[PDB]
Every structure is written in structure tokens, then in C-alpha cells.
């Protein structure tokens, strides 16, 4: 098995489908990565996550470095062994989470000091190494939205300097360089010239994959798509393109249409526990009284184990009762739905009918 | 498959081991019944409950009659279909829960009026019929502890009149009488003469099984065993003996030594979510800092899936983080532990070495 090999099997417009082969397994692209909060995909055993079709999950550097700690996880055999997921894991760099979740933050050229510590590109890489991550993210800065061009520029420039430092730290660790991959993160807010400068900088350094950062920060779908329109083509075509923190099914479809290969979002897990179930006819809230005596499964096409066995009425009852099994069943279905969406996207690109799929999907989903 | 056939395969002193054959499956005795709160064994899919070795679960008449309602469950196909458990289900009568959980209660010869309705023996039987219960419990009154002999007597006497009414209501419903079994409940507090009068009354009516009610209500283990000492022999030998609401592993072993065949308790599920894990060396609280880097499974003999895959350190982390998977893994292990205990009890009685097992179990469990 190779360390990291990306192959594009088919294209339709800007959309691509293919595979990333890594030592711990193959990732089918476009891919959706279920998010692990504290070394767990919430309410799911790893075997269940795999059963939904997931090829890779995301682990959180920020949370894990605090609890149970990176050194501790390393001492216990690494994240894979710790949580019982033996397939690839992508870890975030901590760059976004440190600014989003920390009570107080001090930013400087060295990195970020915070109250739940000091995250730097070097420390981020080290933490991800200690976790045993397969895909390591460069330490970046997610520019707040909106930003002046000047603020966006100085922020993106710092991120690019941090990207080079991340590259060097990663390359310095022989075992990491041998067995893991490193992705760079494009910044530049909504500005085409800065996105270009960022892409150029990242390409000059050279990464295994490129993330489009700085989006899904309140700009809205139209604006996000507008920025993706020009940003993705700036990235190397022959490497995977990862859109961080996205998103709703419609966001995913549109992003794929614009050349994105990888996604992660808390939406299917989070909103699942909240009562939101995804269906091909759009999301439903299972708590609604309308479902109290509905014997149909959450979605009548869905192939997941939940839809094979349990009714809307039962899941309605569980969620209204605050029962853990409610969260379990909703989460498994939603993740499975996301995986089925990705499978349909992959199949349609490979068959050269993705445009029709996107149209058909939207017509029904927003009926 | 028979409606209800109890066979005793082996005995050792007062202990018995055998089987109850019912239409929906075989129950190995002595049996432990995981408790379903609101049509769910908390944090477990039914397939997982079955995987732990459970042959039968307990469903709660009191909770289900309120949410989602008995008629509603019947309309949705019955409790088995609703929750996806196709094996036997025993339902409590509501007699104890109505007094324990209701904000206000009015007691009379008709039954109990309460604020979350009016439960009577007839209504209780009807509700259990609507749920589709396999083992139906007579509607009783659990006398508070302590009670004067006179209060205990009038209470037990009412329960006996209610037992006859439960019998008649059950027998009146052809489909229930054909497919389900009915258990009577002995009362009489801690008084030998009243326990005898209660047993006589129940035997004269005639039931498929007999529960020892009115225990595990704060009397303590010594007193409970003292009462079991004389109470169980009063019950028909050729029918199953069910001790309601018991209990800790040591309570179960002692009760089996005194002729009890069936148990249910919230302990393994409840305390599991709270961080308490059962082991052969006694219970542990997985939240304790001592387990933070412990790579051993919860118990090093346990055959459950949790102990095959995950460490104490990981489960420690999950429970301290408030993660649902923590509750899932703890609950599966604890239920599996209880089932392994029951299997060891069954094997040792069948092999005529139960006395030695009980001694060996206690020496190690309370080391
Ligand atoms: C939910 N929306 C969202 N946008 C994001 C952007 C970044 C980003 O630019 N960098 C890093 N490191 N994580 C991110 C996570 C995001 N999550
Ligand atoms: C946890 N201790 C406990 N003792 C019990 C006694 C009875 C009893 O006498 N009757 C009915 N119906 N349920 C019961 C449930 C119990 N639960
Ligand atoms: Zn489904
Ligand atoms: Zn176990």
C-alpha cells in the first residue's frame, strides 16, 4: 500500500471522481468524512461508521490535545488504536478551532496562545504526529468574515508562512513523512487576487492535497460558490481538493460541481441528535407530531440499517423521550444518507451524468 | 412452540436451572431481564441486547401507557414490532411504578388514580394486552417498608383480590390467554404468616409463574434473604419464581440459592451510564483517574465485544467527556457481564457445583 496516491478515474466539467490510496486504506472521492469530536464519531461504534460507507474520519487536534492529551494518546498506542478505527484519519490543524472555541487567544507570528497552551505550526504538526494522523493539516488562520482586503491579505500571508513551517516540521519527522500526507490550506477570504497569491504560495511549497479554507464562515452559499468558482481552479489539478466544514447536501453537490473532492461537517451527526433527519425529499424533524404514527422508515429509498428496521414513529418516540438509542439511530441514518449521497455523486460522475444527477437531486430535495 | 412451558433440568439445594419455552422463544433460567425504560434498553439496539445473551427483556407498562400510549403502540403493531425485539417481553403491571413515580395518587378498591389516569387490574391487563406482552404481571400493591403487620395485611389482601381480578381479565381475552402467560405477585411485607396467606391465595387462583413482590424496598440484603428463606418455598415449586427489582450480582447469587429463577434490575444499565462497570473482582468506577492510562479491558475475563476491542483508558475518556459511545460501551459490557453471571450460575447448578461457585464468586468479588 502506498503512502498517498491520488488517481482521478473520471471527470465531468470541474467535477472529478477517483481514489486516494493510503497505507490504512482507500478513500473514494468525492468523499465525506464523519467528524469525530473527542475521539468518537458521536453515538456510533467505528464498525457502524464503516458500515455506513465511510472510508475516512476526521479527528480534532484541538479537543484531543486538551483531553486526553496528545502525549497520552501516543502512549496508549495512537488515535487509531485508542478509538478502534483502523482506517485513515484526517486531523485538523487546530488553527480554526483555537480561535473559535478558546476563552482567550493571543495571536502572533509564533502561533496562538490560548486558555482552554500555545499552538504553533511546529506544535500542531507534532500533535498530529503523536495522534498518528494519516492526513495532517497545515496550521493556518481562518480569516474572520467579513474582512477588509488588507486584513485578509496580512492574515493569508501569515497562513502561508505557517504553511511553509508546517511543511518543514512534517518533513523533519521521518516516520510522519514516510507514512502520512500533508495538506496545505488556501486562504484569502473572498478576494480573487489573494486566493491566487495563496494558491501560488502553497503550490511553490508543495503539498499532497489542498484545502479551501476561510469559507463557510457566514458568507452564505451564493458567495461561497462564487469564491469556489475562481479558487478551486487555482489549486493543483492533480491533487485532492478539500472544502473544510461543508456542509448541507446541496452545498456538497454544488462544491463537487466546482471541483471539490473532500468534505467534512458536523451537520449529519449534530443535527441528527437534534431530531433532523436527511431524506431525498429534504430534511425532516422527526420530533414533529406529524411522525407520531408514521410506520415508514426515515427515508423510503435509504439502504441503511435504521431504515431497514425501524419506523419514523419509533424514532420520533425515542428522540422525544431523550433516549440514547434515538441519537444512535438518527446519527447512523444521517451518516449513511451522506455516504449514499457521495456514492451517487461518484457513480454519476463516473457515468458522465452528474449534471443530470445534480439537477434531479435539487428538484426533489427542494420540492 | 408452546405458550408457556417451564422445565427444570437440574437442582442444587433450593436452586434450579431450566427453561421456559414460549411462542417467541426460549428463556434460560435463572434469567436476568434487561430493563426497557421507554421501549428501549437504554443505549442498546435490540440486536446488541440479544448478543449479550439476553433471552427476554422487561417493558414498563407505566411509562408506555403515558408515552407513546398503549392504544398507539397497538396501532403501530405492538411493542415487539415497535422497538424491534422479537423475543419474549415481560411487562410490569404498573402497580409499583404508579406509587413510586406519580406526583399524586388516590388508592381505592377499584385501583389507583394518578397524575402523570386510573390503573385497575382490568386496565393493567388490557394495557399489557395492547402492548402484546408475553409475560403479563398481575396488578398489585407494593407495601411500603416498614409496615405494621396490620397495614401489611390489608395491603396484601387487596393485592390478592386484585390478583383474582387480573386472572379473570386475562382469561377473558382469548388471544391473550392463548399466547401469553400470567404471573401472580406475592406480598405480605416481611411477615411469614402473611407471605403464607398470600402464597395460598395465589396458588388457589393459579398462575403461570409467581413473583416475590414487596422486597428490595429498603429492607437491606440480610432482611431480604431472611424473607426469601421462608417465602420462596411457599410458592408452587413447579412454576418459575421471579424476584422483582433485584439486583446487585451478590443479591442475585443469594436469591438463586433461595430458589429464585428470574430477575430484573436497572442497575447494569443505569449504573453503566454513571460510570460503574461490573468485574469479577467487584465493580469499578471507570471515571476514576486510576484508569486514565489503563489499556486493559473493563474485565480481563469478560467475553463481551467491548472487552474484546476497547480499553479502560478509552472508556474512561468517553465517560468523562459525556460521550454517548461511553454510555453505549459501558451498558453493553454491564449487561453482558450480568448475562455471563447468569450463564455461570446455570452451568454450575446443572453441574452440581453451584455452592462452590457462589463461594468462589463472593471470595473474589468482595476481595
Ligand atoms: C463550519 N465552517 C468551517 N469553515 C472552516 C474553515 C477552516 C479553515 O479555514 N481552516 C481550518 N483549519 N479549519 C476550518 C474549519 C472550518 N469550518
Ligand atoms: C427496585 N426494587 C423493587 N422492588 C419491587 C417490588 C415490586 C412489587 O412488589 N410489585 C411490582 N409490581 N413491581 C415491583 C418492583 C420493584 N422494584
Ligand atoms: Zn436510513
Ligand atoms: Zn465486557
Amino acid at each position: 500500500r502506498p503512502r498517498f496516491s491520488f488517481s482521478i478515474a473520471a471527470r465531468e466539467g470541474k467535477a472529478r471522481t477517483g481514489t486516494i490510496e493510503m497505507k490504512r486504506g482507500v478513500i473514494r472521492t468525492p468523499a465525506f468524512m464523519p467528524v469525530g469530536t473527542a475521539a468518537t464519531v458521536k453515538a456510533l461504534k467505528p464498525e457502524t461508521v464503516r458500515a455506513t460507507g465511510a472510508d475516512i474520519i476526521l479527528g480534532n487536534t484541538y479537543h484531543l490535545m486538551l483531553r486526553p492529551g496528545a502525549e497520552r494518546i501516543a502512549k496508549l498506542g495512537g488515535l487509531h488504536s485508542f478509538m478502534g478505527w483502523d482506517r485513515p484519519i484526517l486531523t485538523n490543524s487546530g488553527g480554526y478551532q483555537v480561535m473559535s472555541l478558546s476563552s482567550l487567544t493571543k495571536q502572533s507570528e509564533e502561533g496562538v496562545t490560548f486558555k482552554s497552551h500555545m499552538l504553533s505550526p511546529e506544535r500542531s504538526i507534532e500533535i498530529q504526529h503523536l495522534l498518528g494522523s494519516d492526513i495532517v493539516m497545515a496550521f493556518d488562520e481562518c480569516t474572520p468574515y467579513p474582512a477588509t482586503p488588507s486584513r485578509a491579505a496580512s492574515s493569508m500571508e501569515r497562513s502561508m508562512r505557517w504553511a511553509k513551517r508546517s511543511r518543514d516540521a512534517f518533513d523533519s519527522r521521518k516516520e510522519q513523512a514516510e507514512n502520512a500526507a500533508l495538506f496545505g490550506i488556501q486562504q484569502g477570504s473572498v478576494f480573487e487576487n489573494l486566493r491566487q497569491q495563496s494558491a501560488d504560495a502553497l503550490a511553490e511549497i508543495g503539498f499532497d492535497g489542498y484545502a479551501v479554507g476561510g469559507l463557510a464562515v457566514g458568507e452564505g452559499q451564493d458567495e461561497m460558490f462564487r469564491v469556489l468558482d475562481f479558487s478551486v481552479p487555482m489549486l493543483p489539478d492533480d491533487k485532492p481538493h478539500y472544502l473544510m466544514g461543508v456542509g448541507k447536501p446541496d452545498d456538497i453537490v454544488g462544491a463537487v460541481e466546482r471541483g471539490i473532492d473532500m468534505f467534512d461537517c458536523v451537520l449529519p451527526t449534530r443535527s441528527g441528535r437534534n431530531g433532523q433527519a436527511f431524506t431525498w425529499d429534504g430534511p425532516i424533524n422527526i420530533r414533529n407530531a406529524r411522525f407520531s404514527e408514521d410506520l415508514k422508515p426515515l427515508d423510503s429509498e435509504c439502504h441503511c440499517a435504521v431504515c431497514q428496521k425501524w419506523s419514523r414513529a419509533y424514532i420520533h418516540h425515542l428522540i422525544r423521550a431523550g433516549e440514547i438509542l434515538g441519537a444512535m439511530l438518527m446519527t447512523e441514518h444521517n451518516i449513511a444518507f451522506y455516504q449514499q449521497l457521495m456514492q451517487k455523486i461518484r457513480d454519476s460522475i463516473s457515468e458522465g451524468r452528474f449534471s443530470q444527477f445534480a439537477q434531479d437531486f435539487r428538484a426533489r430535495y427542494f420540492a
Side-chain angles (χ1 to χ4, degrees), chain A residues 16-62 64-66 68-91:
Chain A
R16 309 103 67 79
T17 186
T19 55
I20 302 171
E21 299 169 61
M22 306 196 63
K23 286 177 183 289
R24 291 183 165 103
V26 176
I27 300 148
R28 291 168 289 175
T29 66
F32 180 77
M33 301 181 285
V35 178
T37 301
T40 168
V41 175
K42 291 171 120 71
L44 297 183
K45 287 175 171 179
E47 60 195 71
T48 306
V49 181
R50 173 58 179 177
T52 68
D55 289 326
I56 174 166
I57 62 172
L58 183 151
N60 259 83
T61 292
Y62 177 81
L64 294 175
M65 70 175 287
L66 293 175
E71 290 280 1
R72 173 172 295 170
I73 284 180
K75 165 172 177 171
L76 297 174
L79 184 56
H80 292 90
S81 181
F82 186 59
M83 67 180 297
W85 174 266
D86 65 15
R87 277 173 187 280
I89 295 178
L90 182 151
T91 46

Side-chain angles (χ1 to χ4, degrees), chain A residues 93 95-96 140 142 185 187 213-217 244-245:
Chain A
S93 60
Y96 170 92
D140 66 325
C142 182
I185 307 177
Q187 296 290 347
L215 297 183
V217 288
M244 321 194 53

Side-chain angles (χ1 to χ4, degrees), chain A residues 175-177 179-203 205-227:
Chain A
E175 195 276 335
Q176 196 171 30
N179 293 295
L182 182 67
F183 280 28
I185 307 177
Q186 185 197 43
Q187 296 290 347
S189 185
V190 301
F191 307 104
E192 189 180 14
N193 65 327
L194 303 180
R195 287 275 168 189
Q196 186 63 72
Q197 173 176 333
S198 181
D200 292 344
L202 294 176
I205 295 168
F207 291 88
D208 294 310
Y210 299 81
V212 174
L215 297 183
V217 288
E219 78 274 14
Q221 191 192 78
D222 295 348
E223 183 72 353
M224 180 177 74
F225 283 175
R226 185 189 71 90
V227 172

Side-chain angles (χ1 to χ4, degrees), chain A residues 2-19:
Chain A
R3 173 191 71 85
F4 190 88
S5 181
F6 179 52
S7 306
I8 295 164
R11 301 178 148 96
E12 185 175 337
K14 291 178 170 178
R16 309 103 67 79
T17 186
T19 55

Side-chain angles (χ1 to χ4, degrees), chain A residues 33-62 64-66 68-96 98-102 105 107-109 111-114 116 118-150 152-173 175-177 179-203 205-247 249-269 271-289 291-295:
Chain A
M33 301 181 285
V35 178
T37 301
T40 168
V41 175
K42 291 171 120 71
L44 297 183
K45 287 175 171 179
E47 60 195 71
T48 306
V49 181
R50 173 58 179 177
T52 68
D55 289 326
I56 174 166
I57 62 172
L58 183 151
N60 259 83
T61 292
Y62 177 81
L64 294 175
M65 70 175 287
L66 293 175
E71 290 280 1
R72 173 172 295 170
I73 284 180
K75 165 172 177 171
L76 297 174
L79 184 56
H80 292 90
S81 181
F82 186 59
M83 67 180 297
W85 174 266
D86 65 15
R87 277 173 187 280
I89 295 178
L90 182 151
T91 46
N92 65 309
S93 60
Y96 170 92
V98 66
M99 295 309 298
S100 172
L101 300 176
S102 302
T105 57
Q107 290 162 292
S108 71
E109 187 71 20
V112 189
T113 293
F114 70 95
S116 174
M118 150 65 89
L119 268 175
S120 59
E122 292 79 14
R123 179 58 184 165
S124 177
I125 295 304
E126 179 180 8
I127 290 170
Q128 297 180 72
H129 182 214
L130 284 171
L131 296 174
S133 163
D134 301 281
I135 301 178
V136 173
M137 297 305 299
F139 188 72
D140 66 325
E141 179 173 297
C142 182
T143 319
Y145 180 80
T148 64
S150 294
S154 60
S155 174
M156 173 275 290
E157 288 159 2
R158 174 149 73 195
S159 284
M160 297 304 94
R161 295 189 296 274
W162 287 358
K164 169 58 171 170
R165 283 167 63 188
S166 300
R167 176 84 255 176
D168 290 345
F170 176 100
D171 290 339
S172 281
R173 297 162 166 71
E175 195 276 335
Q176 196 171 30
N179 293 295
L182 182 67
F183 280 28
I185 307 177
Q186 185 197 43
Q187 296 290 347
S189 185
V190 301
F191 307 104
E192 189 180 14
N193 65 327
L194 303 180
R195 287 275 168 189
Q196 186 63 72
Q197 173 176 333
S198 181
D200 292 344
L202 294 176
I205 295 168
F207 291 88
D208 294 310
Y210 299 81
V212 174
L215 297 183
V217 288
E219 78 274 14
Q221 191 192 78
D222 295 348
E223 183 72 353
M224 180 177 74
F225 283 175
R226 185 189 71 90
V227 172
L228 290 179
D229 282 340
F230 57 72
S231 298
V232 187
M234 300 171 175
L235 303 179
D237 182 84
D238 66 349
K239 303 300 182 73
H241 305 151
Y242 167 28
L243 181 55
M244 321 194 53
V246 175
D250 39 292
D251 292 333
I252 288 180
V253 173
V256 167
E257 287 180 295
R258 292 167 172 80
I260 298 302
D261 309 302
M262 295 169 68
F263 297 93
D264 80 88
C265 196
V266 291
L267 189 60
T269 40
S271 72
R273 304 190 298 282
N274 191 37
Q276 178 169 79
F278 296 92
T279 86
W280 295 110
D281 301 287
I284 61 176
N285 198 299
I286 201 61
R287 303 186 56 118
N288 191 292
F291 301 113
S292 63
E293 299 188 336
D294 190 340
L295 284 170

